[PDB]
Design a protein around this ligand. Sequence first.
Ligand code: ZN
Ligand code: ZN
Ligand code: ZN
Lengths: 71, 66, 47, 59, 258, 115
Amino acid sequence: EKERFRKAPPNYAMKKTQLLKEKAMAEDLGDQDKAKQIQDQLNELEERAEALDRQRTKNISAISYINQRNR
Amino acid sequence: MIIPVRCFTCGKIVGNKWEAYLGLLQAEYTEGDALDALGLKRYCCRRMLLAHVDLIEKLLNYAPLE
Amino acid sequence: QQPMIYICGECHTENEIKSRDPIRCRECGYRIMYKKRTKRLVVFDAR
Amino acid sequence: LNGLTDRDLCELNECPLDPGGYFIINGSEKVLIAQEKMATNTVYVFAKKDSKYAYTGEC
Amino acid sequence: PYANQPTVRITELTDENVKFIIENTDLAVANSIRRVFIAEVPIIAIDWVQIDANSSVLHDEFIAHRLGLIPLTSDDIVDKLQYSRDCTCEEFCPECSVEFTLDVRCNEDQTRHVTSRDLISNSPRVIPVTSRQDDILIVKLRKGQELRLRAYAKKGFGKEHAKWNPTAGVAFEYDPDNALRHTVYPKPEEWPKSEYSELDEDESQAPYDPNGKPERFYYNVESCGSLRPETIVLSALSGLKKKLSDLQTQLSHEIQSD
Amino acid sequence: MNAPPAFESFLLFEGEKKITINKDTKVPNACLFTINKEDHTLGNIIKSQLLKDPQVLFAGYKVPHPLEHKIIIRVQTTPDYSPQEAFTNAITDLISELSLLEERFRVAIKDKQEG
Ligand SMILES: [Zn+2]
Ligand SMILES: [Zn+2]
Ligand SMILES: [Zn+2]
């Protein structure tokens, strides 16, 4: 009942949710179900990337920039 | 894992320079020039900015919540 | 009146687990959970 | 963790630096040491002296 | 059968280090003053940290360790406070200690840089080196973590621990030209000239001098930021004088008792 | 686990004397001064100051063991000059020299600032 209304991505199960979606898409032989699962996985990946960018906007990104320019 | 507060050998504060060192290296300066631009004369204090490995970032990647 | 609060594994959500009860989170449902820091006088000497 | 980005690895309480390739039995990292032996289907002609034979064609 | 009349001359006075020269004194006195500069110099520092909630990634003791190395300015407070060991009360009294507090919790999405600026001190003059140049980075927090604690500072000297070591590095040097032959160079031409060397670029080292005592000791006391350099020198001289006075008093009592 | 604390290097323990005099028996007018909770800082200057005095025939300290905080100073003067007064005079003149050095350094500093 809690997970019914509570949306899935929050918060640490992003990787687990993506793996479950990928497994469901692989298991489902249908076309519409596979497309929907693929779209959901892509949306989850984009959301995770945006969240990481927001969190890694400073320091975590500048360090990568300095490392690449130094190499 | 994190930049120390003072140089083991000398004792000069070096903790308040890691961010400045990264900024100077990013802008245009090189290492050999940035070190003396920050004010590090003795070679004992220069290892803290050259040898130090910044592992706190990888640790922060494992955020507990959200 | 201390029900031995715990912290979930992945949810990091507080849970009240008492004796003779299964070890699971109030939501989702996992099997891993850690304890909370003691309430004692944790005093160190910056030496 | 087959071809998984470092993001998920970090989110799954793992690191991308772990070489991997080790079994997990009862929560213990088990590794298989590569044992070496004599190559099969190859003829070896030794000369054991502490015996009655001058030469031995093992295969 | 008495002491000597040393002379002093400052060559460079700044707010980070001093280069003075001491002439007409024995080597033992110079070396002793150096060792006092490093070890026996009263200064305030963090020595009692009470951590209430530390959700950071580092160890619980790591925070206390880093806080112990953060210098604290004590230009006019170290001389007033008394050693906690010799206090005549209970709990860290403000008359013999200085209280600190740190309460930071990363709420926004970006990562926090908990610097020394977060140490909110109760006293105005006892603050980390942030008056007048980044601040000493303590730890890095991420969204969801926190670091609440309060610590107290007390007076101590380097002989007890390195936290009470004001001087960064003392450059003690005497007799730049190897005149007293205290060191024998196998190949003098291969060595560079000292900064204080008066010898020309032709000759490698000054000639031998049989009847010659060490004088003209050069100093380069470099303050870490807590105490001013000249203040470090004055405190060291006063402390050494106090140690000699106490030793003399004890000796007089011992002789009288016999 | 058995590491000694850091206060046992300078702080006196209950019952331990800061200084003890002990006369030697091998030669006349020779006493060994044993100091507790001190290091080379407080013995080398005294050794040199005694060396300056011509009436002191012998003067030198040591550290019985680095981990132990203790130093023994052996002094031997001429028969008409006891070593106790020699030690007292060495300390007195050394203190005077340090005070004068402090005053000169202070005046030099105050003149250096804008002058
Ligand atoms: Zn150094
Ligand atoms: Zn659960
Ligand atoms: Zn008090």
